[PDB]
Amino acid sequence: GHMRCVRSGCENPPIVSKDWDNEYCSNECVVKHSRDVFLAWVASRNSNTVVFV
Amino acid sequence: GHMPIDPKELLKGLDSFLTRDGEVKSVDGIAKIFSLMKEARKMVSRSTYLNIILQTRAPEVLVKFIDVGGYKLLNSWLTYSKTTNNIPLLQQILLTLQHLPLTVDHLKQNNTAKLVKQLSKSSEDEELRKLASVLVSDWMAVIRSQ
Ligand SMILES: [Cl-]
Ligand SMILES: [Cl-]
Ligand SMILES: [Cl-]
Ligand SMILES: [Cl-]
Ligand code: NA
Ligand SMILES: [Zn+2]
Ligand SMILES: [Zn+2]
C-alpha cells in the first residue's frame, strides 16, 4: 500500500524514491523488509507445527 | 503506472533453483539468477538477490557467479549506491564481496577495490567504515599470499 511503510513494525508514511514505488519510508526499511520476507520464505519451506496455514 | 516489487513472489519464482534455506543449488541456476540480477534496477529486487548470494556457500557456485559477470554487476551496483549515498545497500554489497571468494585477478578487473578502500577512510557511517576496513585487510592478505 501507499499509506504506511510496508515493513512490518514501521508506521511511517512512504517517501518518493526512484529506487522503489512509494511504499518504503527509508533505505533501511527496504533491506530489513527483504530480510524479513526471506526468513519467512525459508520458514515456509521448512518444518511446520501445522499442516495447512 | 507502477508495480511495487514483491520479494515473496521473487523468491517463489526461484523455487526450483534454491534449497529450503535459499541457497543456489547448481551452476545452471546461478546463471539464470544472474540474468535476472542484470535486469534488476529496483532496490527491493537487488537486496533480495544479494540475500540469495549471501546464503549460497558452495564455492564452485560462487565462482561461477563471478565468472558470468557478477563481479562487474556488483561494481555497477556499488557505484550507483555510492553516488546516491545508499548506506544500507552499500553495507549489503560489501558483505557480499566479503562473502565471495575473490582472487587477485578478480580484484584487478574494475575499481571496486579502489571504491572500497575509499570507503574505509572517508565513510561517515561507523559500520560501513569498519566493514570496508576489514574488507581491505582481507584483500591485502590475498595479495600477500602470492
Ligand atoms: Cl536509511
Ligand atoms: Cl500500487
Ligand atoms: Cl527490478
Ligand atoms: Cl545502476
Ligand atoms: Na568488471
Ligand atoms: Zn519504514
Ligand atoms: Zn501504487
Author numbering:
A (entry chain B): 568 to 620
B (entry chain A): 2 to 147
Reported in the publication:
Ser/Thr protein phosphatase 1 (PP1) forms a large nuclear holoenzyme (with PNUTS, WDR82, and Tox4) whose emerging role is to regulate transcription. The PP1 nuclear targeting subunit (PNUTS, also known as PPP1R10/p99/FB19/CAT53), which is one of the most abundant regulatory proteins of PP1 in the nucleus, has emerged as an essential regulator of gene expression. Tox4 is predicted to be a largely unstructured member of the DNA-binding high-mobility group box protein family, which has been reported to restrict RNAPII pause release and early elongation, promote late elongation, and facilitate transcriptional reinitiation.
PNUTS adopts a nine α-helical bundle structure consistent with the PNUTSTND solution structures; its structure is most similar to the IWS1/Spn1 protein (DALI Z scores = 13.4–13.8).42 PNUTS helices 5–9 form the TFIIS N-terminal domain (TND), which is a conserved scaffold enriched in transcription factors that mediates binding with TND-interacting motifs (TIMs) and is the domain that exhibits the greatest overlap with IWS1. This domain has previously been shown to bind directly to the MYC TIM (34VQPYF38) in addition to TIMs from other transcription factors (including SPT6 and PAF1).34 Helices 1–4, which pack tightly against the TFIIS domain to form a single compact fold, adopt a distinct α-helical bundle that is not present in other known TFIIS TND-containing proteins. The Tox4CTD adopts a novel conformation, where aa 571–596 form a zinc binding loop in which Tox4 residues Cys572, Cys577, Cys592, and Cys596 coordinate a zinc ion, while residues 597–612 form a long α helix (the Tox4 PNUTS binding helix). The binding interface between Tox4 and PNUTS is extensive, with the Tox4 PNUTS binding helix interacting with PNUTS α helices α1 and α3 via hydrophobic and ionic interactions. The hydrophobic interactions are toward the center of the Tox4-PNUTS interface. Finally, consistent with its nanomolar binding affinity, the complex buries 2,100 Å2 of solvent-accessible surface area. Finally, subsequent isothermal titration calorimetry (ITC) experiments showed that Tox4CTD and PNUTSTND bind tightly, with a KD = 0.3 ± 0.1 nM.
